Amino acid sequence: DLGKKLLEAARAGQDDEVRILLANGADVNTADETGFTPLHLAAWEGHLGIVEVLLKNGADVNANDERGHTPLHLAAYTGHLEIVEVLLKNGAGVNATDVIGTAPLHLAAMWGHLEIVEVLLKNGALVKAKDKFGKTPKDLARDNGNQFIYELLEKAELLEKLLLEAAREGHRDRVEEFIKRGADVNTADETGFTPLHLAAWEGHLGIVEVLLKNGADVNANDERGHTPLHLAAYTGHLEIVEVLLKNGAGVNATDVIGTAPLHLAAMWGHLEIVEVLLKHGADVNAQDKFGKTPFDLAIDNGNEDIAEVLQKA
């Protein structure tokens, strides 16, 4: 009984009635049929006073409704700047995501709330956070014509963009420069390729050594599960395969299809890479979607020379 009253006194904005109910023992973390709590409703309707009293009585600042929305999601959706700052001040998760990977920044940027975008960024909101549909806040702001927000997130991405371009084009002095200026060495592009993915793909050995030297993730996956070692075994750059394994590259890393670096080394006839992978404990028993082992793939592509090595094991 008290639960329902508190929930509707928050929705309705009745400050005095919320005080009375909480003093009579009403549960501050009460939840309705879909998981909305009093703090959810006060944030949606924009009742700053109530928000502050509920948190003051031990209200869960990161409660999740049935869909995964938190009070911060709702404040950023409706554009209530003052309430956003209160929620973060009380320990609200700035990078919380609902069931389709939506963060507060996605919503602020989509509904065109410049000030909230800025406050969310100031508290560590991920600039390139991708939702369930591959969309960042910058994408959502572009598609909705929120010009100022687009230009702000584009600026907030530029440094990480130039590192990715530098690593792809093979410009070592630019890679070094942008790392020295705070570039996130593990940033990702539109498909999950990190600078290390792109240097291995293009065969830029020098830059692969520099990236690992500055704490690049050697076993990073893109959106399809490919690690850097995967790409180096496909393209057939032996020296990059050697550098990755020296830094703990998962030799038996499997992508979304189960394919491992040894599958591609045999499929595209790269004898030298096969040896090094087996030296580091590459399992030949592993299969994949098609159910084929690295030995089967060596015969299909007319490469019996590599197949004879696998037989011996």
Residue numbers in the entry: 13 to 325
Study text:
In this paper, we present a strategy to fuse specific, high-affinity protein binders to obtain multivalent or multispecific scaffolds of predetermined geometry. DARPins are used as building blocks to confer the desired specificity to the construct. A series of rigid connector modules replacing the DARPin capping repeats allow to combine the individual DARPin domains in such a way that their distance and angle can be altered to test different geometries, bringing the binding partners of the DARPins into a defined spatial arrangement. The two helices are not just joined end-to-end, but instead the two domains are made to overlap in such a way that the joining helix is stabilized by contacts with the domain cores along its entire length.
In the context of DARPin-β-lactamase fusions, we observed that the paratope of this DARPin has a high propensity to form major crystal contacts, leading to crystal formation under a wide variety of conditions. Indeed, constructs D12_Hxx_D12 with H02, H09, H11, H13 and H15 yielded diffraction-quality crystals in space groups P212121, P6122, P212121, C2 and P1, respectively, at resolutions ranging from 1.8 Å to 3.5 Å. Only three of the D12 constructs did not rely on paratope-paratope interactions, but instead relied on paratope-capping repeat or paratope-connector module interactions as dominant crystal contacts: D12_H11_D12, D12_H13_D12 and D12_H12_D12_H12_D12 (P21). The propensity of DARPin D12 to engage in crystal contacts is so large that, where the crystal geometry does not allow for its preferred interaction, alternative interaction geometries are observed. These are found as paratope-paratope interactions, interactions with the DARPin N- and C-caps, with connector modules or with the target protein of a second DARPin in the construct.
